[PDB]
Design an enzyme around this catalytic site. Structure first.
Site, PDB file in Angstrom:
ATOM      1  N   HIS A   1      -9.002 -31.740  29.236  1.00 35.69           N
ATOM      2  CA  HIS A   1      -7.671 -32.399  29.860  1.00 35.69           C
ATOM      3  C   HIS A   1      -7.344 -31.673  31.053  1.00 35.69           C
ATOM      4  O   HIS A   1      -6.860 -30.431  30.992  1.00 35.69           O
ATOM      5  CB  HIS A   1      -6.805 -32.446  28.931  1.00 35.69           C
ATOM      6  CG  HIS A   1      -5.455 -33.002  29.344  1.00 35.69           C
ATOM      7  ND1 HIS A   1      -4.470 -31.976  29.404  1.00 35.69           N
ATOM      8  CD2 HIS A   1      -5.019 -34.124  29.518  1.00 35.69           C
ATOM      9  CE1 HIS A   1      -3.468 -32.693  29.870  1.00 35.69           C
ATOM     10  NE2 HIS A   1      -3.679 -34.145  30.047  1.00 35.69           N
ATOM     11  N   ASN A   2      -7.061 -32.489  32.047  1.00 40.02           N
ATOM     12  CA  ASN A   2      -6.642 -31.940  33.358  1.00 40.02           C
ATOM     13  C   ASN A   2      -7.567 -30.633  33.731  1.00 40.02           C
ATOM     14  O   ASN A   2      -6.775 -29.652  33.771  1.00 40.02           O
ATOM     15  CB  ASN A   2      -5.283 -31.792  33.280  1.00 40.02           C
ATOM     16  CG  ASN A   2      -4.531 -33.293  33.348  1.00 40.02           C
ATOM     17  OD1 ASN A   2      -4.865 -34.009  33.784  1.00 40.02           O
ATOM     18  ND2 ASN A   2      -2.975 -32.908  33.225  1.00 40.02           N
TER      19      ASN A   2
ATOM     20  N   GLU B   1     -11.721 -34.140  33.910  1.00 40.47           N
ATOM     21  CA  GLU B   1     -10.688 -34.866  34.571  1.00 40.47           C
ATOM     22  C   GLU B   1     -10.690 -34.397  35.880  1.00 40.47           C
ATOM     23  O   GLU B   1     -10.189 -33.119  36.372  1.00 40.47           O
ATOM     24  CB  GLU B   1      -9.649 -34.726  33.778  1.00 40.47           C
ATOM     25  CG  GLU B   1      -9.626 -35.683  32.303  1.00 40.47           C
ATOM     26  CD  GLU B   1      -8.363 -35.747  31.563  1.00 40.47           C
ATOM     27  OE1 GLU B   1      -7.308 -35.484  31.916  1.00 40.47           O
ATOM     28  OE2 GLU B   1      -8.376 -35.978  30.286  1.00 40.47           O
TER      29      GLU B   1
ATOM     30  N   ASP C   1      -7.678 -35.505  38.991  1.00 43.69           N
ATOM     31  CA  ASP C   1      -6.572 -36.247  39.292  1.00 43.69           C
ATOM     32  C   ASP C   1      -6.547 -36.336  40.802  1.00 43.69           C
ATOM     33  O   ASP C   1      -6.262 -35.376  41.283  1.00 43.69           O
ATOM     34  CB  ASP C   1      -5.276 -35.742  38.753  1.00 43.69           C
ATOM     35  CG  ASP C   1      -5.216 -35.688  37.245  1.00 43.69           C
ATOM     36  OD1 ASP C   1      -6.048 -36.462  36.591  1.00 43.69           O
ATOM     37  OD2 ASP C   1      -4.234 -35.321  36.649  1.00 43.69           O
TER      38      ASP C   1
ATOM     39  N   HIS D   1      -1.815 -31.713  39.980  1.00 46.70           N
ATOM     40  CA  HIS D   1      -1.268 -32.527  38.836  1.00 46.70           C
ATOM     41  C   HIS D   1       0.057 -33.525  39.433  1.00 46.70           C
ATOM     42  O   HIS D   1       0.923 -32.784  39.819  1.00 46.70           O
ATOM     43  CB  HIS D   1      -0.827 -31.681  37.655  1.00 46.70           C
ATOM     44  CG  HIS D   1      -0.151 -32.504  36.452  1.00 46.70           C
ATOM     45  ND1 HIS D   1       0.940 -32.088  35.669  1.00 46.70           N
ATOM     46  CD2 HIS D   1      -0.753 -33.569  35.940  1.00 46.70           C
ATOM     47  CE1 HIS D   1       1.326 -33.154  34.741  1.00 46.70           C
ATOM     48  NE2 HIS D   1       0.189 -33.855  34.881  1.00 46.70           N
TER      49      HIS D   1
ATOM     50  N   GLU E   1      -8.717 -40.299  37.850  1.00 43.68           N
ATOM     51  CA  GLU E   1      -7.308 -40.928  37.666  1.00 43.68           C
ATOM     52  C   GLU E   1      -7.162 -40.905  39.197  1.00 43.68           C
ATOM     53  O   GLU E   1      -7.014 -39.924  40.016  1.00 43.68           O
ATOM     54  CB  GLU E   1      -6.351 -39.847  37.001  1.00 43.68           C
ATOM     55  CG  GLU E   1      -5.173 -40.142  37.034  1.00 43.68           C
ATOM     56  CD  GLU E   1      -4.056 -39.279  36.442  1.00 43.68           C
ATOM     57  OE1 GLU E   1      -4.836 -38.997  35.136  1.00 43.68           O
ATOM     58  OE2 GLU E   1      -3.095 -38.990  37.022  1.00 43.68           O
TER      59      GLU E   1
HETATM   60 LA   LIG Z   1      -4.642 -36.455  34.371  1.00 42.37          LA
END
Ligand SMILES: [La+3]
Ligand SMILES: [La+3]
Ligand SMILES: [La+3]
Ligand SMILES: [La+3]
Length: 513
Positions: free
Chosen positions: A112-113, A142, A144, A157, A191
């Site tokens: 995650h992230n 991931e 972003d 983030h 994302e």
């Molecule tokens: La995210």
């Protein structure tokens, strides 16, 4: 005294005892006696002269004994401390599962992230973070993406003060490490918060950098189900929204189209298409498991579901994956940067099947018609109670941790069972004071596990402190089906998942129906 000291420090009665039983009167283990040990004690299924001989050829230090086909106490110990004597099945440390079923059938190692190294609010981001995860076998990463200066998209983030990095830089790192730990497919979760222009730049970078590794077209005859890890070997696939969104990107989304959770209903309508993937926060996931359970499970047979940590986990803490796996959730994203029982359990799961990052789900969880709900256990194939008895005999060279040179560890051991709720349990040994070199506990615990196919056994060693929180010393988590029987050594890992070369626990494991 010298031999005394030298050798006495070196002396392990438990080993002595174990050998003695095995060898009896003799000072040596003959093949037959070894084979008997392998069967009776070690419960090896392939037990026979062949194994016995290989163990001898492999581990026996004595030339005489080796040649004469016998095992000395020394060779016994070596075998016991080797990969073959490891409580974590050596056989399972190589890809051995069926890698030909739809992705939806495997648990996938997911982060995650991924770009983050610390917290979610203001800590740093770095390509290093992707390298580390990948080197730990992570399959699903991931990204972003946000608009950056010079028409170069960045990754960070969204809406926080986390340091930034370049999307292109991230792609090179992924490109370089995507398969260092496994040949199976890597999934990049995009994302996308980028402007149309920068989205085009993303697409360019993707194609330019990933090149042929990038999957940009459906595989031939990949129609009704998701391709298998085998079919996608050596490929990287994109997950994201598919036609705000430029075609260049949307067109690269083949098997993982981001979708909002509709609900579960499978007769061709409602429960999304095999190539559609929904995400659920830790909270919503629990609720759906609370309320639906079997729907989710059944949903998860032909569909990939992604779960991510609750928003309040700004400290990058992790939730327990096990609870999600019990519902067949495959893409259970955790903050890989964070040491704890959670990653301990996670990486223990994925150490299975060769550490390739895809672990085949139990059959009842691959049956579209299953009436399984880990939360409402009824009879079915998943129900297969076992009696596990674990004897924590002693510990060897426990890593002295915190103090630089002032004190000796005061070790105790906790043994936990992780799996369906009714199976979860924990027990602990007493504390041995001032002894990390060779603490001896000789304590035995017994657990009843009703759904072993979902269980993991964890060994945790702590340094007891009356005044403070006990220091973690080492740990090891072994999937139930990889747990070897008999006398074995548990090889302890650091908080960070690193191997402690000489730190072990010596145990005797027994599993009976
Ligand atoms: La995210
Ligand atoms: La102490
Ligand atoms: La202490
Ligand atoms: La301490």
């Amino acid at each position: 005294e010298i031999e005394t000291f030298y050798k006495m420090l070196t002396q392990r009665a438990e080993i002595d005892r174990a050998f003695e039983e095995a060898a009896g009167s003799a000072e040596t283990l003959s093949v037959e006696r070894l084979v008997t040990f392998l069967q009776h004690q070690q419960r090896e299924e392939e037990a026979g002269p062949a194994l016995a001989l290989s163990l001898i050829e492999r581990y026996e230090p004595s030339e005489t004994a080796k040649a004469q086909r016998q095992m000395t106490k020394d060779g016994f110990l070596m075998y016991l401390l080797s990969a073959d004597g490891n409580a974590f099945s050596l056989a399972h440390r190589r890809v051995y599962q069926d890698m030909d079923q739809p992705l939806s059938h495997y648990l996938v190692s997911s982060s995650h992230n991924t770009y983050l190294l610390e917290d979610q609010l203001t800590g740093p981001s770095s390509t290093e973070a992707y390298i580390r995860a990948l080197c730990k076998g992570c399959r699903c990463l991931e990204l972003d993406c946000w608009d950056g200066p010079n028409q170069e998209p960045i990754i960070y983030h969204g809406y926080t003060f986390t340091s930034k990095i370049l999307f292109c830089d991230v792609l090179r790192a992924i490109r370089d490490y995507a398969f260092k730990a496994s040949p199976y497919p890597v999934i990049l979760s995009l994302e996308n918060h980028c402007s149309l222009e920068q989205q085009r730049v993303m697409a360019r970078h993707l194609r330019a950098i990933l090149g042929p590794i990038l999957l940009d077209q459906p595989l031939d005859g990949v129609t009704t189900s998701l391709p298998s890890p085998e079919q996608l070997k050596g490929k990287i696939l994109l997950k994201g929204k598919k036609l705000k969104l430029v075609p260049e990107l949307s067109d690269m989304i083949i098997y993982c189209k981001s979708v909002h959770f509709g609900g579960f209903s499978s007769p061709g309508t409602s429960g999304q298409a095999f190539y559609e993937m929904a995400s659920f926060s830790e909270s919503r996931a629990l609720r759906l498991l609370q309320e639906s359970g079997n729907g989710f499970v059944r949903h998860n047979v032909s569909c990939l579901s992604r779960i991510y940590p609750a928003g309040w986990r700004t400290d990058s803490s992790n939730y327990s994956p096990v609870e999600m796996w019990n519902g067949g959730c495959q893409i259970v994203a955790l903050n890989f940067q964070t040491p704890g029982p959670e990653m301990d359990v996670y990486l223990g799961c994925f150490q299975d099947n060769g550490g390739c990052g895809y672990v085949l789900k139990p059959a009842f969880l691959r049956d579209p018609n299953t009436t399984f709900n880990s939360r409402a256990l009824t009879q079915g194939p998943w129900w297969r109670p076992e009696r596990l008895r674990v004897r924590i005999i002693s510990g060897q060279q426990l890593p002295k941790v915190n103090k630089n040179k002032n004190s000796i560890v005061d070790p105790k051991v906790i043994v936990e069972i992780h799996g369906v709720g009714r199976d979860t349990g924990s027990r602990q040994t007493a504390v041995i004071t001032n002894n990390g070199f060779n603490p001896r506990w000789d304590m035995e615990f017994e657990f009843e596990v009703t759904v072993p196919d979902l269980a993991l056994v964890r060994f945790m060693v702590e340094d007891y402190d009356s005044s403070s929180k006990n220091d973690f010393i080492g740990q090891s988590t072994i999937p139930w089906n990889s747990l070897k029987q008999g006398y074995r050594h548990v090889h302890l890992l650091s908080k960070n998942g690193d191997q402690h070369p000489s730190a072990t626990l010596f145990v005797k494991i027994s599993i009976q129906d």
